């Protein structure tokens, strides 16, 4: 399954989402290498990840190494785990770092564990053609560092063009937060987005942002930045209707 994404060509009977363009996940001159089982594949900026071979509504794990060439030397920028959550009309990636380049000593590596979200893409629902009314309930997954078992629940009131949800069952209690009510605003590319506050007993503990995906607003996908006592923690978000 994971090895097929790195080696097998595109089949159209493969279930969507079939393609996920790696924009923010691989930067212009960098070179991201993904490994799973005995397979491995190299990606550049703008290349497509064969998400069709991956399982829907699950987190897929790849070992990764990020590299760029400076002068005439391949410095290893970053090493760790590359995560992908796949849905029918959306998908998002994340990087669990284990070592990063020593900025002040060329060729050296320093241990440092970060978790960040990479690329949130799919068939963006245009803001102008959203459901003109009604109420849809999205249910899915919230995943952070070393935890892919938190539950996303979100509801969108398309009449009021509002939205609210919460996160539950993450192992870290600071992270199971409420996603406060917020507006559905248009993006610069007219994508339908929702930017709101993270709450935790009705007080500011961060912020979140979701995009609506699918021609019928079937799915939402985004990320939550949650202020904690030990710094910011990034959580991936993805949910779908029934």
């Amino acid at each position: 399954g994971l090895a097929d994404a790195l080696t097998a060509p595109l089949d159209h009977k493969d279930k969507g989402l079939q393609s996920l363009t790696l924009d923010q996940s691989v930067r212009k001159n960098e070179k991201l290498k993904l490994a799973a089982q005995g397979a491995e594949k190299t990606y550049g900026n703008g290349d497509s990840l064969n998400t069709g071979k991956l399982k829907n509504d699950k987190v897929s794990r790849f070992d990764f190494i990020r590299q760029i060439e400076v002068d005439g030397q391949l410095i290893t920028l970053e090493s760790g785990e590359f995560q992908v959550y796949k849905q029918s009309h959306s998908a998002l990636t994340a990087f669990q770092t284990e070592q990063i380049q020593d900025s002040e000593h060329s060729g050296k590596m320093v241990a440092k564990r970060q978790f960040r979200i990479g690329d949130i893409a799919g068939e963006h629902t245009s803001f102008d053609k959203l459901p003109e009314g009604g109420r849809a309930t999205y249910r899915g997954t919230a995943f952070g560092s070393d935890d892919a078992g938190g539950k996303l629940t979100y509801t969108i009131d398309f009449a009021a063009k509002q939205g609210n949800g919460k996160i539950e069952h993450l192992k870290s209690p600071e992270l199971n937060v409420d996603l406060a009510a917020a507006d559905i605003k248009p993006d610069g590319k007219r994508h339908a987005v929702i930017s709101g506050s993270v709450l935790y007993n009705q007080a500011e503990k961060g912020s979140y942002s979701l995009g609506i995906f699918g021609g019928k607003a079937q799915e939402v996908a985004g990320s939550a930045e949650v202020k904690t006592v030990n710094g910011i923690r990034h959580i991936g978000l993805a949910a779908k209707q029934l």
Partner: antibody, heavy 122, light 103 residues
Framework: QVQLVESGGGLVQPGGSLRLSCVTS????????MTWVRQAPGKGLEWVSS????????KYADSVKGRLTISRDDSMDTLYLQMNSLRAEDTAIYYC???????????????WGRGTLVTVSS | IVLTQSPGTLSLSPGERATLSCRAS??LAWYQQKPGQAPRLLIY???NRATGIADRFSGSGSGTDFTLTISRLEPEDFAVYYC?????????FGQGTRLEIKR
């Protein structure tokens, strides 16, 4: 204060099986790739296998591929090498080594164990 | 990538400068192995040194020609040295080079 300790080496019949263990200490095992390197008697070093920090990606040299399987248990900080269909040219001292980064076979080996001897003959 | 270390043996005195060459066909590393002991990491690209490795050792070169330079030989520095590329699978080692004491 990193220390690697190999064990499980010994005498093996051609075609037999052996399992090597490399119990580690002094570092966070779960964050780094591990590597097996072997040295035939009187000759140089030869890379055998490497496993990622997660165990989700393994690499082998073509001369041992399919017959040797690398594995790890993070809860026990132990690295394994399951050696099957053991041939005479597999006779060597096998060294377990730690990589500098989590991705397998893409970094120097900064710490080595003291090796274990595997002898394959009739 | 086949690596060839020339020459095979180097007979030097203490306090003398040692030049060890490793040819390619980057990122390369160097290891030291004393009689009856396991190998150890010496330097790595470009010339970073492992913990407990004195400034005597240094590396240079790009393209194909890579060099390990020991400025002042010490009696403990007389051993076998293996070069090793990692930025290209499969991992390959050099055949080695002895440093023996001159007399």
């Amino acid at each position: 204060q990193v220390q690697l300790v190999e064990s499980g080496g010994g005498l093996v019949q051609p075609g037999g099986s052996l399992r090597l263990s490399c119990v580690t200490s002094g570092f966070t095992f779960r964050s780094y790739a591990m590597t097996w390197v072997r040295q035939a008697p009187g000759k140089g070093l030869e890379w055998v296998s490497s496993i990622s920090h997660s165990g989700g990606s393994t690499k082998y040299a073509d001369s041992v591929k399919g017959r040797l399987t690398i594995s790890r248990d993070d809860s026990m900080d132990t690295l394994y090498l399951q050696m099957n269909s053991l041939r005479a040219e597999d006779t060597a001292i096998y060294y377990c080594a730690k990589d500098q980064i989590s991705y397998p076979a893409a970094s120097p080996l900064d710490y080595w164990g003291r090796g274990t001897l595997v002898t394959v003959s009739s | 990538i086949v690596l060839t270390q020339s020459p095979g043996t180097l007979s030097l005195s203490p306090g003398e400068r040692a030049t060890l060459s490793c040819r390619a066909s980057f990122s390369l590393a160097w290891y030291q192995q004393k009689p009856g002991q396991a190998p150890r990491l010496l330097i790595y690209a470009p010339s970073n040194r492992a913990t407990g490795i004195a400034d005597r050792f240094s590396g240079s070169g790009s393209g194909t020609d890579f060099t390990l330079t020991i400025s002042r030989l010490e009696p403990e520095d007389f051993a076998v040295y293996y070069c090793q590329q990692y930025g290209s699978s499969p991992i390959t080692f050099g055949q080695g080079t002895r440093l023996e004491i001159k007399r």
